[PDB]
Amino acid sequence: MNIFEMLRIDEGLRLKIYKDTEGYYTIGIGHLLTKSPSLNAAKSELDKAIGRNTNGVITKDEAEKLFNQDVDAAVRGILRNAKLKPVYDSLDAVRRAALINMVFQIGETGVAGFTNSLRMLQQKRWDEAAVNLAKSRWYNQTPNRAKRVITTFRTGTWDAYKNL
Ligand SMILES: [Cl-]
Ligand SMILES: [Cl-]
Ligand SMILES: [K+]
């Protein structure tokens, strides 16, 4: 298990433009194209991201390319965020992956704002942190995924991704 395998399980792999859980145009491995309700806008973003006129369909290799960029970008954002960096730096690798996962899905801004959860994590109060994290729109809207991420933070193990 690793952050790529983990997010690959949580995000799936789809080669054509589709709507994510929030109803936003996405493609590949959770590559958010835009929040715009316009398919055309989404196609325009895709073409720009990929470097060619796609007409909304990409290859697996292309999906993987965006994904790698996305994973890296999330990490990079974390390292550049004053709120997340210290937390991120305080964690073991497994937990770091859980954090990257959250940022990838929720967005850096949202995560950076979970002040209390972030503090519990940094304090290494795993169970408490886990309880705290569930008190969110995040958990409510995507509880199965949230539970996996949460268990990862609680335990420091990949048990949640075990038989996936
Ligand atoms: Cl991009
Ligand atoms: Cl879910
Ligand atoms: K998805």
UniProtKB/Swiss-Prot annotation:
Changing E11 to A/F/H/M/N: Complete loss of enzymatic activity. Its main location: host cell. It is found in: Host cytoplasm. This is Endolysin. The active site is at E11 (proton donor/acceptor), D20 (proton donor/acceptor). Its EC number is 3.2.1.17. It catalyses: Hydrolysis of (1->4)-beta-linkages between N-acetylmuramic acid and N-acetyl-D-glucosamine residues in a peptidoglycan and between N-acetyl-D-glucosamine residues in chitodextrins. InterPro entries: Endolysin_T4_type, Glyco_hydro_24, Lysozyme-like_dom_sf, Lysozyme_dom_sf, Phage_lysozyme-like, T4-type_lysozyme. Induction: Expressed late in the viral replication. GO terms for molecular function: lysozyme activity. Endolysin with lysozyme activity that degrades host peptidoglycans and participates with the holin and spanin proteins in the sequential events which lead to the programmed host cell lysis releasing the mature viral particles. Once the holin has permeabilized the host cell membrane, the endolysin can reach the periplasm and break down the peptidoglycan layer. GO terms for cellular component: host cell cytoplasm. The gene is E. One of its GO terms (biological process) is defense response to bacterium. It comes from Enterobacteria phage T4 (Bacteriophage T4). Pfam families: Phage_lysozyme. Keywords: Antimicrobial, Bacteriolytic enzyme, Cytolysis, Glycosidase, Host cell lysis by virus, Host cytoplasm, Hydrolase, Viral release from host cell. Substrate binds at L32, F104, S117, N132. Changing S117F: 10-fold decrease in enzymatic activity. Optimum pH is 7.3. Belongs to the glycosyl hydrolase 24 family. SUPFAM superfamilies: Lysozyme-like. Changing E11N: Loss of 84% of enzymatic activity.
